[PDB]
Design a protein around this ligand. Structure first.
Ligand code: CL
Lengths: 101, 93
């Protein structure tokens, strides 16, 4: 199964599915409430934030697992935009770890 | 095509690149020293002030700028480099 997640527009993890533990080394409750950029090196922070400034491909970046080692993750992005009093945006992710062969 | 701007922590425009004229209708000199709020659609003032006060970002801030000719242009802006000044890049959508 893909890992499913939701981010607030500011990168805070609102939701991630429980298979975060298998693939990323974190229980879903260790990640929800934290910012995605906490689990990335600087190169990857810039890579991912750049993605949202302009897409032909999913967002591919290195994630630092709980054990401090990196995995490559490919993230399919959908934005839900809702216009009420202010316009608000949520990011829906479908992610998978790109495994070494 | 990115407009580069630097804002003081109170929103005062410290610097804006020369392509402000092209995209926004104002020369740099007409904007530098003014508050960025002065140029924003009045409805987008909470949204933008709040965006640029906050430390954590992922998505750009999308808002309306009022050009010199009194018409709207939509732009997105992102913190470009991080009493700290904010360095932002922005572009017309
Ligand atoms: Cl930032």
């Amino acid at each position: 199964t893909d890992i499913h997640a939701v981010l607030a527009s500011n990168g805070r993890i609102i939701y991630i599915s429980a298979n975060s533990k298998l693939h990323l080394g974190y229980l879903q409750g260790e990640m929800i409430g934290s910012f995605l950029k906490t689990f990335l090196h600087e190169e990857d922070q810039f890579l991912v934030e750049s993605y949202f400034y302009n897409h032909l491909m999913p967002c591919t970046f290195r994630f630092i697992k709980k054990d401090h080692t990196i995995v490559w993750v490919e993230a399919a992005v959908e934005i839900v935009t809702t216009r009420a009093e202010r316009t608000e945006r949520e990011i829906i992710l479908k992610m998978k770890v790109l495994e070494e062969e």
